[PDB]
Structure formats: structure tokens, C-alpha cells
Swiss-Prot record, chain A:
The lineage of its organism: Eukaryota, Metazoa, Chordata, Craniata, Vertebrata. Residues 1-206 are annotated as: Self-association. It is linked to Estrogen resistance: A disorder characterized by partial or complete resistance to estrogens, in the presence of elevated estrogen serum levels. Clinical features include absence of the pubertal growth spurt, delayed bone maturation, unfused epiphyses, reduced bone mineral density, osteoporosis, continued growth into adulthood and very tall adult stature. Glucose intolerance, hyperinsulinemia and lipid abnormalities may also be present. Residues 3-206 form the NR LBD domain. Nuclear hormone receptor. The steroid hormones and their receptors are involved in the regulation of eukaryotic gene expression and affect cellular proliferation and differentiation in target tissues. Ligand-dependent nuclear transactivation involves either direct homodimer binding to a palindromic estrogen response element (ERE) sequence or association with other DNA-binding transcription factors, such as AP-1/c-Jun, c-Fos, ATF-2, Sp1 and Sp3, to mediate ERE-independent signaling. This is Estrogen receptor. The gene is ESR1. The chain holds residues 309 to 546 of 595 of the full protein.
């Protein structure tokens, strides 16, 4: 029922912290710690907790890598040619099979700068990834009504910046089309790298 | 020219550029994959002729036309297949004479997973009553979008052109929806629903590439036509 402004506010307040840091051992350990904070960020995505724990775990399981990636890209925009994994972990391109995904993450940062992605826009993109990455009946309806509620919020945000309706649906399309690339990097990321379901449930206890 | 097209003129060109539906040869579990590979192989030739007719596409360099098609060709086959199958619940219409069900897919190692994912996309389009004009817009977006992030001054010019053309197709999708009577919220919501499905088609494409591995040269040579 929330308004677009209240939607934004709740998402902005739910942002997880930036965490701090043998390269792959460091990156795995950092990703494990971020995942915990992702779970509690997910709880605060409005509409998410209305789902069953089984649906909650299905979405998180299908989207966690995409979420770590778009968050990496978001904090790496002001660091051209480099990924800011952690504030004490800034790697560039020279830092088997890694450089292709690293090249893809950089081009994602480059695209975010080209579009001048806004923070408000970013937290809507993350929520869309959470609810959409796994949607493929009452549950789906709800997921799609909330995805619809987030669409309404992205348009409001753009209208508030003074964009014409033409520029609004154009920018919305451009933002949602980046999600395919992020899905693509996640797929390629999964290849390059007890069930995660059971760990995801356990994290949902705190 | 492509950027001066109206929405209707964009729909019209996309519809006219549509490739024909092909058939399989005039069956068993053992020959299934040879038939599907023959089909894809012939469809690809026609896919090239279709892409050359998507407004703005031939304004690109050859090398960039190849890149876009290497990146999108499987997604385009799949979205074509899903569209053909929309009106056959539980079934994929690879060709009018090659309609397969989940069980026939179970026959191959790893196939049913892709097959269940393709079948759900088809039911999702069905639930949305996807129109033909929106379909040809979605397939064009896949063509121009799928590789635009895996590419010089010249390359910057190229990507800017692609995103301008992708904007015109977005104006065209919205024009269709307003033409279909939709309110301005529903227009934005349906546009988003359609473009999020493309994420799932990408997902299917990559899982599909792993199954097919479990072409650059060819594309240039269908694209790099002489003028004789
Ligand atoms: C048993 C518990 C299971 N966990 C869950 C899966 C299992 C390892 O998952 C992991 C392991 C490492 C990562 C990092 C990481 C960390 C933090 C970040 O913000 C972002 C990223 C980005 C990422 C995803 C591409 N990555 C890389 O290194 C990288 C590789 C190639 C090119 C560029 C970057 C992410 C997830 C351990
Ligand atoms: C030099 C070129 C080399 N060729 C070009 C690539 C190389 C074969 O690639 C191929 C081979 C087969 C296909 C079919 C096919 C055919 C027609 C169609 O319209 C759509 C599809 C969809 C598709 C992609 C999922 N598929 C399957 O069977 C299938 C698998 C798992 C579950 C369900 C279906 C598509 C591409 C040989």
C-alpha cells in the first residue's frame, strides 16, 4: 500500500553496510559475510516476508550472486577500471577464468556511469533482482504485484527528476535491460566458481 | 532512416522482416537431436536475413553485427520457439511437424531442465496474452541488447546508436500498449514485465549453451554479403 516515496525510504534505510576484507579465500570469506547482511536486507524489502520461507529461500537462492554483483558494481563506479570489493580490497584488471567476468563487471560500472545511475534507482534495481530472478499462484501474483509496485516507484522517481514520460519509459527500459547482463554475469560467475537452501533458512532465524 | 521511423512504421518493418516458420524433415528418440540441430542450423540462415532488416542494424560495422548475433542467436531461437509454443500448453512446437512434450525431452541428459524453463516462459506469455507486435519488438531488443556490454571512438559511436535504436523500440512497445487501450500505469508495468522475462531468456540461453557444449566465421559469411 506504500507510496513511491515510502517505498524508496524503506529501501534506502534497508541498505546493508559495506564490509571489510589467497585472493579467492579473501573473496569467498567476504561474500559469506555479505550474504548474512543480504538476508536481513531481504527481510526489509517490502512484501518479501509475506512469502513462505520456502518461497523466500527460493528467491534468495536464485538471486544472491546477482545481488553481490550489482552491489559491487555500485560501489565501484567512482573507481574506473577497478572493483571495490571492500574499502581495503581494491583490485584492478591484472589482479583462471576471472578476467572475463571482471571485464563484464567493469563494463557494468561503465554503463552505470554512462547512465548516471541514482542511489534511489539502484535500490529499486536490487529489489527487482530479488523478486524476479526466481519467479520462473497466489505467491506469483503477490511477487508480480510488488514488482509492479517497484515499477511505479522507478517512474515516480524519474518524473520527480523532471523527465518526460518519453524519457521515463526509455530510462526504465535501459535500467531493466542491464538486469539481463547481470543475470548473464551471474550465470558465468556460477560456472567459474550441504545445500544453500538449508544455510539460507538458518540465516533467516536471526 | 531507422531513427526517423514512427512507431507504426517500426512495427511494420519488424513484421515484414519476420522469418518464415521452418519444418523438420519428413521419428525416434535417437534421431531427435539431429533433427533439432538441423532445424536450428537452417533457422540461423533466416535469422541473419531477419537481423539485416531490423532498423539500424546494418548501420553497424560488420564486426559489431557479428558480435551481436553471436551473443543473441540462442536467445532468439528460444524466444521464437516459446512464441510458437504459446498456444500449445505443456508442449514445444519446434516445427509444425515437430511438436514435443516433456517426456520426450526426458530422453536426453540435462534437457528436461531447459525444457521446463522454456515451457514456463511460454505459459507466462500465454498468461500475459503476448501480441505478435510485442513479440517482434522483444526479439529485436534481444538482438541489439544481448551483446552491447561485451564490446575506441568508433565503438562508442556504435553503442550510442544501438541504445538510440533500443529507445525507439521502447517507444514502439509503449505505443502498442496505449493503442491496446492500456492506462499509463499498465503501460509501464507491462513494459517492465516483458523486459524482465528477457532476463529469464538470457538465463535459459546460458544454461542452454552449457547443454549444447556438454560460428563467428559462419555469421560473417552470411552477413558479409557481396553486392553482386
Ligand atoms: C559455503 C557458502 C557459499 N558461499 C557462497 C558461494 C561460495 C563462494 O561464493 C562467492 C565467492 C566469491 C565471490 C566474489 C565477490 C565477493 C564479494 C562481493 O561483494 C562481490 C563478489 C563478485 C564475485 C561474484 C563475482 N566474486 C569474485 O571473486 C570474482 C570472480 C571473477 C571476477 C570478478 C570477481 C562471490 C561469491 C561460498
Ligand atoms: C555452425 C552452427 C552450429 N550449429 C548451430 C549451433 C549448433 C546447434 O545449436 C542448437 C542445437 C539445438 C537447438 C534446439 C532448438 C532448435 C530450433 C529452435 O527454433 C529452437 C531450439 C531451442 C533449443 C535451444 C534450446 N534446442 C533444443 O534442442 C533443446 C535443448 C534442451 C531443452 C529443450 C530444447 C538450438 C541450437 C550447431
Amino acid at each position: 500500500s506504500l507510496t513511491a516515496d515510502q517505498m524508496v525510504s524503506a529501501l534506502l534505510d534497508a541498505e546493508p553496510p559495506i564490509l571489510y576484507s589467497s585472493m579467492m579465500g579473501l573473496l569467498t570469506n567476504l561474500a559469506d559475510r555479505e550474504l548474512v547482511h543480504m538476508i536481513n536486507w531481504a527481510k526489509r524489502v517490502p512484501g518479501f516476508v509475506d512469502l513462505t520461507l520456502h518461497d523466500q529461500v527460493h528467491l534468495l537462492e536464485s538471486a544472491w550472486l546477482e545481488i553481490l554483483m550489482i552491489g559491487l558494481v555500485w560501489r565501484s563506479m567512482e573507481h574506473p577500471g577497478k572493483l571495490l570489493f571492500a574499502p581495503n580490497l581494491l583490485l584492478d584488471r591484472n589482479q583462471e577464468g576471472m578476467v572475463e567476468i571482471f571485464d563484464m563487471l567493469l563494463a557494468t560500472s561503465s554503463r552505470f556511469r554512462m547512465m548516471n545511475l541514482q542511489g534511489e534507482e539502484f535500490v529499486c534495481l536490487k529489489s527487482i533482482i530479488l523478486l524476479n530472478s526466481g519467479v520462473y499462484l497466489e505467491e506469483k501474483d503477490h511477487i508480480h504485484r510488488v514488482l509492479d509496485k517497484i515499477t511505479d516507484t522507478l517512474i515516480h522517481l524519474m518524473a520527480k527528476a523532471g523527465l518526460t514520460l518519453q524519457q521515463q519509459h526509455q530510462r526504465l527500459a535501459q535500467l531493466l535491460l542491464i538486469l539481463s547482463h547481470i543475470r548473464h554475469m551471474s550465470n558465468k560467475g556460477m560456472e567459474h566458481l550441504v545445500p544453500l537452501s538449508d544455510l539460507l533458512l538458518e540465516m533467516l532465524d536471526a
